[PDB]
Design a binder for this molecule. Structure first.
Ligand SMILES: OC[C@H]1O[C@@H](O)[C@@H](O)[C@@H](O)[C@@H]1O
Length: 484
């Protein structure tokens, strides 16, 4: 049992700000989201082959305090408890991811039956408890074998490797999983993996592992798009009419607000949207890359053949938008001109304040600014720009510093205000015609936050890493109250 202050009843819990299920469309889904590597543990066990993150983690100094996700919050063994918390808090759904290398230790070939069994236990238990499973197929965890064989996303070989893996998952799990995502944040897979080397496999221009920031991110993104399209084709031709599910992709989207009303600032904000979201959503909706990207990046960007363009266009039933934050965008003056990096290709200036006033308070993470109206502007933008496609707001949340006690950690009033305000702004966008059908908080549990390790807590449930005990935060109860 914890210190007395743990059990103070935060009155913010009961201020739902006017929100309930009645403020949302009939059958609107409220969920939480996690990922295999961040929550499962058993990284080197249960027959799981290693991923790129397992080798990347081995360089000392990469994770703070050289922490690993070998155990993390141990959802492999504690999945029943986690599902029960989800149910008790009133959630309808859980978006989780399947570990490619847990099913295919070598990426292709032999199946790890022990991994298959785990996901079957997990899915069977969610169905038993009335939590809808939303399965994401890839969450930063490429099997290491594939990276060793042909450098993973940088080779056209990855496309059939992935499609076959997707295919197997549909065959095996699709009798009860009716909601699929191919990828989480392919932009990040490409940009962090191959532009700045911040994420595995740590490739970039200056990087230890080698790389080329001018070409490799574009090559990676191209094969991610082809792999998504190839996977969806399997689903549609072989499973969809029989299983009656749906398939989409999850795309991160930072809102870019023009800094001023000038043509140049307004154009800069559009350019950033092109490179951030358009990069993936233009091909999926129009069968082609953003014009700006083609004119700036020229031949450093691959092109789709006519056959590819047809496979890629309309290759979703819905799009998941992951949204956290917003920045101001400036025209940065005259552009160079000589290729440097995907990020430099955007040719923009970032701004985090205007007239001495910050755009929002900062969460723990260096990148996260709390800007509730950004979620409204983002959703309206995809509605207007893309013919109002069916959307899931597939991630939203914020982090506390990792190094806080149970007692301090559970009283997360800042997160309550975060969710109340963001969900209010999302509601306004729906009232004005946006076709959103679900919302997912990141995340249920404090977990392994990639390069930040355990110095960042995103959960609505506090996890003591010493004991692995769960303590619902005030924000979990805020949801419980709002959802009934
Ligand atoms: O930063 C919080 C979260 O944001 C998205 O990238 C998620 O898909 C996770 O990978 C991550 O933990």
């Amino acid at each position: 049992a914890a210190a007395p202050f743990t059990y103070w009843l935060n009155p913010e819990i009961y201020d739902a700000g006017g929100l309930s299920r009645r403020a949302f469309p009939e059958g609107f889904v409220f969920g939480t989201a996690a990922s295999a590597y961040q929550v499962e543990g058993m990284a080197k066990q249960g027959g799981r082959g290693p991923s790129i993150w397992d080798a990347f983690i081995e360089k000392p100094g990469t994770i703070p305090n050289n922490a690993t996700a070998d155990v993390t919050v141990d959802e492999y063994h504690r999945y029943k408890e986690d599902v029960n918390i989800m149910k008790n808090m009133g959630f309808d759904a859980y978006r989780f991811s399947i570990s490619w290398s847990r099913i295919f230790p070598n990426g292709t070939g032999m199946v790890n039956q022990e991994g298959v069994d785990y996901y079957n236990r997990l899915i069977d238990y969610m169905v038993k408890k009335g939590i809808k499973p939303y399965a994401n197929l890839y969450h930063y965890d490429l099997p290491l074998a594939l990276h060793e064989q042909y450098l993973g996303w940088l080779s056209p070989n990855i496309v059939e490797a992935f499609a076959d893996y997707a295919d197997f998952c549909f065959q095996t799990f699709g009798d009860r999983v009716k909601d699929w995502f191919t990828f989480n944040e392919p932009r990040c897979v490409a940009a962090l993996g191959y532009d700045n080397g911040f994420h595995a496999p740590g490739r970039c221009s200056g990087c230890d592992a080698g790389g080329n920031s001018t070409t490799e991110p574009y090559l990676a993104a191209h094969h991610l798009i082809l792999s998504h399209a190839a996977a969806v084709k399997r689903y549609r031709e072989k499973y969809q009419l029989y299983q009656k599910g749906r398939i989409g992709i999850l795309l991160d989207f930072v809102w870019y607000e023009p800094f001023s009303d000038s043509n140049a600032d307004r154009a800069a904000a559009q350019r950033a949207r092109d490179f951030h979201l358009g990069w993936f959503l233009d091909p999926i909706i129009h069968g082609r890359y953003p014009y700006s990207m083609l004119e700036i990046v020229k031949d450093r960007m691959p092109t789709f053949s006519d056959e590819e363009s047809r496979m890629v266009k309309d290759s979703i039933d819905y799009v998941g938008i992951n949204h956290y934050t917003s920045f101001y965008m400036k025209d940065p003056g005259p552009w160079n001109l000589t290729p440097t990096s995907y990020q430099d290709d955007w040719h923009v200036g970032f701004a985090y304040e205007r007239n001495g006033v910050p755009i929002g308070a900062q969460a723990n993470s260096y990148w996260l600014y709390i800007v509730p109206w950004g979620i409204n502007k983002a959703v309206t933008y995809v509605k207007e720009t893309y013919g109002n496609p069916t959307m899931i707001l597939s991630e939203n949340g914020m982090d506390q510093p990792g190094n806080v006690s149970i007692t301090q950690g559970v009283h997360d009033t800042v997160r309550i205000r975060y969710y109340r305000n963001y969900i209010t702004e999302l509601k306004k966008a729906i009232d004005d015609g946006a076709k959103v059908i679900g919302y997912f908080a990141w995340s249920l549990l404090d977990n392994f936050e990639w390069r930040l390790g355990y110095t960042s807590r995103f959960g609505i449930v506090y996890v003591d890493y010493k004991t692995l005990k769960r303590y619902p935060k005030d924000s979990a109860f805020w949801f419980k109250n709002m959802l009934s």
